[PDB]
Design a protein around this ligand. Structure first.
Ligand SMILES: NC(=O)c1ccc[n+]([C@@H]2O[C@H](COP(=O)([O-])OP(=O)(O)OC[C@H]3O[C@@H](n4cnc5c(N)ncnc54)[C@H](O)[C@@H]3OP(=O)(O)OC[C@H]3O[C@@H](n4ccc(N)nc4=O)[C@H](O)[C@@H]3O)[C@@H](O)[C@H]2O)c1
Ligand SMILES: [Mg+2]
Ligand SMILES: [Mg+2]
Ligand SMILES: [Zn+2]
Lengths: 34, 110, 14, 1108, 170, 94, 333, 57
DNA sequence: TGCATCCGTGAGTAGA
DNA sequence: TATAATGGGAGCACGGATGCA
């Protein structure tokens, strides 16, 4: 009953992250903070 | 008793056991209902004071699973059993009032 | 092969 | 209206009684109408004579039996869920030869089921049909050895479960080998046991070179028959001590004992006729004067040798010849089970004999009752009867199954038995068979065919003497038929004499052109080649066999309609079907109608006696189609013998009416008739064509439980007067009430289980001050998608007259709910030619294509369904229907002899006059639209250029094509369209019954997976192949959902539901329960299954629960 | 066997868009039922979930509010249609349901070939993808209008046929 | 057909990656009540009820339309998961 | 005129050029107008639409003539039983063909708008055989044993069969039915086998960097073995289309780079090149030669044939293969 | 397939055929632990073989 | 080494 | 718990992998 290693379950595509530019720069300046 | 593996169709594709529901494990609806009931009781117990809600919780068993006697809850809050009886009474009374206004817990009475 | 036959035989040996 | 019947052929004999294959077979098995001393050794009489006397009280003997009267009538049996049956008694005398004692008593053996008037049984309240079984006739056969061409196998076959198949072979080493119970051994040995000597065998089998030398063995003839008997017994039974009387008993049972080994009367005859010998009994050998004496074996070995040697007049056997395959009807099957139950009863007798003894003490009839009950209830050949319409029952009774106990299993049947053998002609219908996995295994008895006393199917032929066709009709088996040149039925005759110098005939099935001097016999009719259903298809000669199959079968699926009509084009069997199916009701003698009611008709006959025929009214068949008779005669009406008193279900004036006659246009319509879909006019609903009554039966029990009684009551906890509104004083819904899904039929309360409330319950009860009741609501409610009007409620209580329920049951309530179903989208329609489809659109009358006179068509069928299907019978039916639509008449156009084109054109011309001339006299000429269309038809080559408009319209009409206007526009359809009357049936597959959905619902006990089927509120099966489809799309999450959240992951489905009602996103799924089950089942198999992490450490998927 | 699934008789959908299928109301009410409960609660239709379900139990307790609510529930969502036997991946396809009166599932003409479906009484099964992930998969990967070409030959699978060819040819 | 599906496939090396991006983004939209959207008021997906135009409740319709704009950044190892979730909880609480 | 093939090609080209959203739109337009016109076109079927060519009678009479020339030659001993039966079968086969051609030529010349003819020609419904049985003769029927009857069926469903003819037909009908019935199970079993053997194969990476490949022959030795001939177009397409070139291929002045996915046009080009004798075989990346463990690679698999573009990593090509092979299985005769 | 008018791409068949060739039989163990006539996957024996080539075995 | 034996396998969904 | 009793009874078909000639 696991998630198959094909399609959307592939190690190639499945760790892909989405982020918007606002949240992206919001983090980017916080990692540029320290 | 009869065998769960008694055939059903004329071809052998089918067992009699397969038409028998499980009456034990709570249906997803049942589970969801007791969940909503815990959450709604918790919503209604926050409109009380922490002490009177705790008194009702200890008295009805929502806390440890056991329903404590008035002398025990009175011994727990350091008050008289009559006092804890009355705190219980006004708690339940306020609950009946909030219920009368909000209508929220009625549906759960089945 | 057939347990009853075998046991019958063993029985017949006494 | 008027009925014109076409065709030249006169049927010399009528159709035989159509259910006789059932009726006569059972009548013969029971012999109830015969006095006990006048009974033959057939049937259950045979059973008793075979089982008794029971020897070693001392001897128990059988004198006679008798069948009493049925304790309850049929309608009562169906009501109370009883079996229609008669008591069976047997007069038995226990005799002691030593004592000289005789004690004679009539013992009660229980009941035996009775066949009804129509050929069916009522078994525990439901109607059942015993389907006949085709199989290999017992006898002696010779087939080619597949391994060694030029060599043969002789096979000796008895009746099923009547003893061992024996094979006689000539082995490579030269010695002839007998095979019994999968043990080969030299036949010579058995031959010696039979009393044969080397000189006798040299005499008989010497004529065939070198074979008998292979039969010759010194050591065998050296030993006496006794020694050879014991040797044989040691060959058949290793480890069994070789005592001689033991060996005699065994070999006697194997080859001799008539109670163990039985050839049929059929097998006896066949062995005799093949081997050219005479059988004393029905067995392979005998025991006489203390020794074994041969009957079968030597003739068999002889024939085998002669065949091997190429000696003339010796041939192999077609095992698929209908001379080698025989039908086992109800009588034979039931008698077989009777024989079994009786043998068990007899074992009980002998067992009881060894421990002041009468017959009633020695005899327990429980095993017999059990064999009979088991045959009728649980057999495969015992089928829940198909009563959808009357024709469906008729066909059911005439079914021939190659399947069942003592017969082939599916997938073990190759092309051989599924084939249409040449000998099927006039015996088994080449058309009507199931499509799919059962093709050729289930078949139907041909219309004129009869199963004879030996179980072979016979077809009638006419004696032809010197080109003169007599009316003498001989019924032949296949082997008999193999002797003659038989002319076809449409052979031209002037009077009784053959009028052609070349006649088409059959010699051993082979088509051949002969002379009237060579014609020995002639077919009775083409009707005889086909089943009853196939015989109801007009223009069948114009229909490809594959679709004819479909029409043939689909007729048995037709639903009885409230407005039902007989076809405009009939084959002529429509009346005989209604008559033999016992659907309608007829006048027994000549007379006058005294009274006519909806419920009853009363007729005074010549004799003067006043007879009252009650009418069956809105009764629910097995399939839930409504069976009811309507009075067809009025008070004071004079009726003859056989005249029609009352129409049955799906009967119009005693003609079989399976459907409606609708005006069709064949033309595509806007995609709505795409790929076999059908468009119908809303007018059809308005006039109630295709409307059918259906009745559903719901049932509920109140039983004694350990926590209290369940009970039927109007008092149901927490329910509104709104909810209890239609419930009567006792809790049962009142007659006439309309019920919808969710409504209560019967109120019932059950005592709550053993439970303590969780803290939430306690606190809640405190808040509302409402004590939790002792009982909960178990009421039977109308299921999703069901409901209608309540037309009946039966109630049965414990402690009431004539009523006893299963142990523990206090009371049983049954509610009946009737619904009138209008034709709707998704319902299935079909014609007799195998054109079938679902209604995809119901158009308002103003959108229908319509004739110039404003008449809209009822049904639009797509022409694209015709050409690849090759069934043109519907086209001819449509033309004839056009003509008959304007002349106001119906036709009888029998199969292969019937209306040809020219006569159809004549009728069409006459029709055109009515269609057109009326308009020309009303003061209307041709329409500009008709002119445009005529221009088109002219360009299409449909009409001749230069002719008048009326002449061209007639030219179109004779081709059955009319100008048709589009309802949406008013512009004509660019070309002329085929429009005419067609007979179309509404089938049993209705979308109302099949439409189902589930959100969540009951789960299975072990697997924790959703149950199956609409009635269980089950989920759809998403199986291996569907999983493969999801994998192939690479939709991993959808898949994982199917495997977890939506099925057996308990935490997951719970969480998913809660999260969906909260508007939360669905949770990450967890371990599916069936996997835990697999793991535990593998642990049960002593295998350790361990889920591991990437470090090879054990992961617990049982969450600590299973670990100490 | 799975939850959130149903089956019925298919019937031709000529009016439908390639990405749509006709889905009976009565079916959709059951398939999407929990969503319909949530939506009935968001709107005025019920005090809470339990009242909403009780109100859906009896068929005469149902009002047009719940139908419009169910319309709002399925908006943008797809269901999977499946016909047995499922021979290749295109035996399951995704469609946006258009809610219809009556008990038949309506199927688009151009997908018949791929399903090997026709109107002689064939039935199909419907499945609801639950998750946003399942819906993403369904709408992007499985949607009828997104698979036009056979994975096997690469030739158009969804193509003019029967009456369509007939008319264009004519 | 999903509007702009061809361009959507244009955006990624593997269609399954498109599906993952869309699904995750829709989970984000659902979690944050849409308050985090990259769409302008006039770019907002609409649904027609009896009363009138309302926001499209379908988060996947949304996510796809967003992805079409260019305003979303996708890929592997953009930012630690707990950090992304926390910065989003800070920026758009709920 | 637009028929099945032309429309299919239109859809494919429109897919390649305009993409799937537009092609879905085109498909719906084609659907709409097609249905609309097919409604008003006046397509119907009357019995007279199955047109018996006069030629049939002649072709029959002539057959009966030669039918004698065989019979006589048997009596005189020139012909054996086998040679005679075989000559009769050949005669009736050629006659059947004759009346087919008669039916369609008659349609085309005198009735090009005949419904049966139009339906057959367009690809809407029907093939020549079914039309023949409707119009010309049903032809030869098989015995249960499978061997052919001497007597054909002269009738058409138009004319109607004799009961004897009909019964003769039923043998073939039933053998066909039982064959289908027993075949679907073998096909099913095969499919599950293939799925089981291929399931783990997925596209796991874009390149396995193998240097190996397979060469697709554009020519085959003739059965005469007299010369080499060009393979049928579709065979070449099925071996070539959507594949990555293993090596650079220079033909007809066009340079097809190494690593290029062959389009249908690239394939056509190569075929035309082979016609001009410039190339006899094409180097191509293949799953056969792929070094990817547990599956194939993008370059070796080539197109996802459903999208007409390079396959997306993560696609389960094993299941797709097994299904692609298994699906037609019940059609194999 | 061609005979039946079924257009099917070669690569689908090539994938299955590839699976048909997945295995090999040892005709000599060399320095390995393997046995003569032992069947195993071509991949595994290629790995092993290059490990033993790396060892000089 | 070749003949013989034992053993395992034979489409899906519905439904009953 | 005591007369003696002592051996049963029913019952297709193909491939592949192995054992035996
Ligand atoms: N069968 C009985 O014992 C019985 C008891 C009581 C009453 N009746 C009556 O006879 C009718 C049922 O007949 P049968 O079931 O015995 O035989 P038949 O195939 O002709 O049934 C006709 C329809 O039933 C459906 N059906 C049957 N088996 C099915 C399976 N395994 N899967 C799906 N459907 C199945 C089917 O709808 C039949 O209609 P068609 O035969 O015209 O086919 C329509 C479409 O269904 C699909 N399909 C069919 C058959 C199979 N094996 N697989 C399929 O996928 C195809 O898409 C096809 O185009 C009752 O009406 C009753 O009066 C019988
Ligand atoms: Mg179908
Ligand atoms: Mg079809
Ligand atoms: Zn590679």
């Amino acid at each position: 009953g696991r998630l198959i290693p094909a399609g959307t379950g592939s190690d190639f595509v499945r760790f892909t992250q989405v982020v918007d530019q606002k949240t992206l720069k919001a983090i980017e300046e916080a990692r540029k903070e320290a | 008793p009869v065998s769960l593996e008694t055939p059903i169709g004329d071809e052998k594709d089918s067992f009699y056991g397969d038409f028998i529901p499980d009456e034990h494990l709570p249906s997803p609806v049942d589970a969801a209902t007791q969940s909503l009931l815990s959450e709604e009781l918790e919503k209604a117990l926050s409109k009380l004071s922490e002490r009177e809600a705790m008194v009702l919780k200890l008295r009805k068993g929502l806390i440890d699973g056991r329903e404590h006697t008035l002398e025990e809850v009175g011994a727990f809050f350091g008050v008289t059993r009559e006092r804890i009886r009355q705190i219980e009474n006004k708690a339940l009374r306020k609950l009946k009032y909030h219920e009368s206004r909000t209508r929220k817990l009625r549906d759960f009475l089945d | 092969s057939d347990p009853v036959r075998q046991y019958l035989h063993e029985i017949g040996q006494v | 209206m008027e009925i014109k019947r076409f065709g030249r052929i006169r049927e010399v004999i009528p159709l035989p009684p159509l259910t006789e294959i059932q009726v006569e077979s059972y009548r013969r098995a029971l012999q109830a109408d015969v006095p006990p001393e006048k009974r033959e050794n057939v049937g259950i009489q045979a059973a008793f004579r075979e089982t008794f006397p029971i020897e070693e009280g001392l001897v128990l003997d059988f004198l006679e039996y008798r069948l009493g009267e049925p304790p309850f009538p049929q309608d009562e049996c169906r009501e109370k869920d009883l079996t229609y049956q008669a008591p069976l008694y047997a007069r038995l005398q226990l005799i002691h030869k030593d004592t000289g004692l005789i004690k004679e008593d009539e013992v009660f053996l229980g009941h035996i089921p009775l066949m009804t008037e129509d050929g069916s049984f009522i078994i525990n309240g439901a109607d059942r049909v015993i389907v006949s079984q085709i199989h290999r006739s017992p006898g002696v056969y010779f087939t080619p050895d597949p391994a060694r061409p030029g060599r043969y196998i002789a096979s000796i076959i008895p009746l099923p479960k009547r003893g061992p198949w024996i094979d006689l072979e000539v082995e490579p080493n030269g010695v002839v080998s007998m095979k019994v119970n999968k043990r080969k051994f030299p036949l010579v040995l058995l031959l010696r046991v039979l009393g044969y000597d080397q000189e006798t065998l040299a005499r008989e089998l010497g004529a065939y070179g070198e074979l008998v030398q292979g039969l010759m063995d010194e050591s065998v003839f050296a030993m006496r028959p006794e020694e050879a008997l014991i040797r044989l017994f040691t060959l058949l039974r290793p480890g069994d001590p070789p005592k001689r009387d033991k060996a005699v008993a065994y070999v006697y049972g194997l080859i001799a004992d008539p109670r163990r080994y039985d050839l049929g009367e059929a097998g006896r005859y066949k062995a005799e006729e093949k081997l050219g010998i005479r059988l004393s009994g029905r067995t392979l050998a005998r025991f006489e004067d203390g020794e074994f004496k041969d009957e079968v074996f030597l003739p068999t070995l002889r024939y085998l040798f002669a065949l091997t040697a190429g000696v003339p007049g010796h041939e192999v056997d077609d095992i698929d010849h209908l001379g080698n395959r025989r039908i086992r009807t109800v009588g034979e099957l039931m008698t077989d089970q009777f024989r079994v139950g009786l043998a068990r009863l007899a074992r009980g007798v002998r067992e009881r004999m060894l421990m002041s003894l009468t017959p009633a003490k020695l005899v327990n009839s429980r095993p017999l009752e059990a064999a009979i009950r088991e045959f009728f209830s649980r057999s495969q050949l015992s089928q829940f009867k198909d009563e959808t319409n009357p024709l469906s029952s008729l066909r059911h009774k005439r079914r021939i199954s190659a399947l069942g106990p003592g017969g082939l299993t599916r997938e073990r049947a190759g092309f051989d038995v599924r084939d249409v053998h040449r000998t099927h002609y006039g015996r088994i219908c080449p058309v009507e068979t199931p499509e799919g996995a059962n093709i050729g295994l289930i078949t139907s008895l041909a219309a004129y065919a009869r199963v004879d006393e030996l179980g072979f199917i016979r077809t009638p032929y006419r004696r032809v003497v010197g080109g003169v066709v007599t009316d003498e009709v001989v019924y032949m088996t296949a082997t008999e038929e193999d002797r003659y040149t038989i002319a076809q039925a449409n052979t031209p005759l002037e009077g009784n004499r053959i009028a052609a110098e070349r006649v088409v005939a059959r010699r051993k099935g082979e088509p051949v052109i002969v002379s009237p001097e060579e014609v020995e016999f002639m077919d009775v009719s083409p009707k005889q080649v086909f089943s009853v259903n196939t015989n109801l298809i007009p223009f069948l000669e114009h229909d490809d066999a594959n679709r004819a199959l479909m029409g043939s079968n689909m007729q048995t699926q037709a639903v009885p309609l409230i407005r039902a009509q007989a076809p405009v084009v009939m084959t002529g069997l429509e009346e005989r079907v209604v008559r033999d199916s016992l659907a309608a009701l007829y006048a027994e003698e000549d007379g006058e109608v005294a009274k006519v009611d909806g419920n009853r008709i009363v007729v005074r006959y010549e004799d003067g006696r006043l007879v009252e025929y009650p009418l069956r009214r809105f009764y629910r068949s097995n399939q839930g189609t409504a069976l009811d008779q309507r009075p067809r005669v009025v008070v004071g009406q004079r009726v003859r013998k056989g005249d029609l008193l009352a129409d049955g279900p799906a009967s119009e004036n005693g003609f079989l009416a399976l459907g409606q006659n609708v005006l069709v246009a064949i033309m595509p319509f806007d995609g709505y008739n795409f790929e076999d879909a059908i468009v119908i006019s809303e007018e059809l609903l308005k006039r109630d064509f295709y409307t059918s009554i259906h009745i559903e039966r719901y049932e509920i029990e109140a039983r004694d439980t350990k926590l209290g009684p369940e009970r039927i009551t109007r008092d149901i906890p927490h329910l509104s007067e709104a909810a209890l509104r239609d419930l009567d004083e006792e809790g049962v819904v009142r007659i006439g009430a309309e019920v919808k899904p969710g409504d209560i039929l019967v109120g019932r309360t059950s005592f709550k289980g053993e439970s303590e409330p969780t803290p939430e319950e306690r606190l809640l009860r405190s808040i509302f001050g409402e004590k939790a009741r002792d009982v909960k609501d178990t009421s039977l409610r109308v299921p999703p998608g069901e409901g209608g009007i309540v037309v009946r409620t039966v109630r049965l209580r414990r402690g009431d007259p004539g009523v006893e329920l299963k142990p523990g049951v206090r009371e049983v309530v049954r509610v009946y709910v009737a619904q009138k179903r209008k034709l709707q989208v998704g319902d299935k329609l079909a014609n007799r030619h195998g054109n079938k489809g679902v209604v995809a659109k119901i158009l308002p009358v103003e959108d229908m294509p319509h004739l110039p006179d404003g008449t809209p068509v009822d049904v639009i069928l797509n022409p694209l369904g015709v050409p690849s299907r090759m069934n043109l019978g519907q086209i001819l039916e449509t033309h004839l229907g056009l003509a008959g639509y304007f002349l106001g008449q119906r036709y009888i156009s029998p199969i292969f002899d019937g209306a040809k084109e020219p006569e159809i054109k004549e009728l069409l011309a006459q029709a055109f006059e009515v269609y057109f001339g009326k308009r020309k006299g009303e003061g209307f000429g041709v329409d500009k639209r008709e002119v445009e269309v005529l221009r088109r038809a002219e360009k299409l080559g449909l009409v001749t250029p230069g002719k008048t408009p009326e002449e061209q319209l007639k030219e179109l009409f004779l081709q059955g094509k009319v100008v048709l206007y589009d309802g949406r526009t008013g512009e004509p359809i660019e070309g002329p369209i085929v429009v005419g009357q067609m007979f179309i049936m509404k089938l049993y597959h209705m979308v109302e019954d099949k439409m189902h959905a589930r959100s969540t619902g009951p789960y299975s006990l072990i697997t924790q997976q959703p149950l199956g089927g609409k009635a269980q509120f089950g989920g759809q099966r998403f199986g291996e192949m569907e999983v493969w489809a999801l994998e192939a799309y690479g939709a991993a999450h959808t898949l994982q959902e199917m495997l977890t959240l939506k099925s057996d992951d308990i935490e997951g489905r719970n969480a998913a539901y809660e999260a969906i009602i909260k508007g939360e996103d669905v949770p990450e799924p967890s371990v599916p329960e069936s996997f835990r089950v697999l793991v535990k089942e593998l642990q049960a198999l002593a295998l350790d299954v361990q889920t591991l992490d990437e470090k090879d450490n054990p992961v617990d998927i049982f969450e600590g629960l299973a670990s100490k | 066997r799975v939850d959130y699934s149903g089956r019925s008789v298919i019937v031709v959908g000529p009016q439908l868009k390639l990405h749509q299928c006709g889905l009976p109301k009565r079916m959709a009410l059951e398939l999407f039922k929990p969503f319909l409960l949530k939506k009935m609660e968001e709107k005025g239709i019920a005090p809470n979930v339990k009242a909403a379900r009780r109100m859906l139990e009896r068929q005469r307790d149902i009002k047009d509010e719940v139908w419009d609510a169910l319309e709002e529930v399925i908006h943008g969502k797809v269901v999977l249609l499946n016909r047995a036997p499922t021979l290749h991946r295109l035996g399951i396809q995704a469609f946006q349901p258009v809610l219809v009166e009556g008990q038949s599932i309506q199927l688009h003409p151009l997908v018949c070939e791929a399903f090997n479906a026709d109107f002689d009484g064939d039935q199909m099964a419907v499945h609801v993808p639950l998750s946003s992930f399942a819906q993403a998969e369904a709408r992007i990967q499985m949607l009828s209008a997104h698979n036009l070409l056979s994975p096997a030959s690469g030739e158009p699978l969804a193509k003019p046929s029967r009456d369509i060819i007939l008319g264009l040819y004519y | 057909a999903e509007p702009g599906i061809d361009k959507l496939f244009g955006m990624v090396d593997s269609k399954y990656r498109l599906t993952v991006v869309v699904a995750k983004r829709a989970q984000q939209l659902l979690r944050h009540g849409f308050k985090n959207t990259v769409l302008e008021p006039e770019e907002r997906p609409k649904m027609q009820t009896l009363e009138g135009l309302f926001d499209d409740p379908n988060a996947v319709t949304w996510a796809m339309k967003e992805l079409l704009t260019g305003r979303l950044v996708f890929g592997e190892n953009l930012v630690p998961e707990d950090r992304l979730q926390k910065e989003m909880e800070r920026l758009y609480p709920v | 005129p637009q028929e099945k093939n032309s429309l299919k090609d239109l859809v494919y080209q429109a897919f390649l050029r305009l993409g799937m959203e537009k092609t879905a739109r085109l498909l719906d337009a084609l659907k709409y107008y097609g249905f609309t016109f097919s409604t008003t076109s006046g397509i119907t079927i009357g019995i007279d639409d199955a047109v018996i060519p006069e030629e049939k009678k002649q072709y029959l009479e002539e057959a009966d003539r030669k039918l004698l020339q065989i019979e006589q030659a048997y009596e005189m001993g020139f012909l054996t039983d086998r040679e005679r039966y075989d000559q009769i079968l050949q005669l009736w086969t050629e006659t059947t063909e004759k009346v087919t051609q008669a039916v369609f030529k008659n349609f085309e010349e005198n009735y090009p708008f005949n419904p049966l003819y139009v339906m057959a020609q367009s690809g809407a419904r029907g093939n020549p055989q079914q039309i023949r049985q409707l119009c010309g003769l049903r032809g030869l029927m098989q015995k249960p044993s499978g061997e052919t009857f001497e007597v054909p069926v002269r009738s058409s469903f138009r004319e109607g069969l004799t009961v004897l003819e009909y019964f003769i037909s039923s043998h073939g009908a039933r053998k066909g039915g039982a064959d289908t019935a027993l075949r679907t199970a073998d096909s099913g079993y095969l499919t599950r086998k293939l799925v089981d053997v291929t399931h783990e194969i997925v596209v796991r990476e874009a390149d396995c960097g193998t240097t190996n490949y397979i060469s697709v022959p554009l020519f085959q030795p003739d059965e005469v073995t007299r010369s080499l001939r060009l393979r049928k177009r579709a065979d070449i397409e099925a071996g070539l289309y959507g594949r990555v070139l293993a090596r650079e291929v220079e033909v007809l002045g066009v340079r097809l780079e190494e690593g290029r996915y062959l389009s249908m046009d690239d394939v056509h080009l190569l075929i035309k090149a082979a016609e001009a004798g410039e190339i006899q075989e094409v180097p191509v990346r293949s799953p056969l030669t792929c070094q990817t463990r547990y599956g194939v690679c993008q370059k070796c698999y080539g197109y996802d044939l459903s999208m007409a573009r390079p396959v997306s990593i993560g696609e389960a090509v094993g299941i797709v293969a097994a299904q692609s092979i298994g699906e037609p299985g019940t059609q194999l005769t | 397939y061609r005979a039946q008018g079924v257009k099917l791409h070669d690569k689908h068949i090539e994938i299955v055929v590839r699976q048909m060739m997945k295995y090999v039989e040892v005709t000599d163990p060399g320095d390995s632990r393997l046995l003569e006539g032992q069947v195993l996957e071509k991949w595994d024996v290629e790995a092993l073989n290059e490990r033993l080539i790396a060892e000089g075995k």
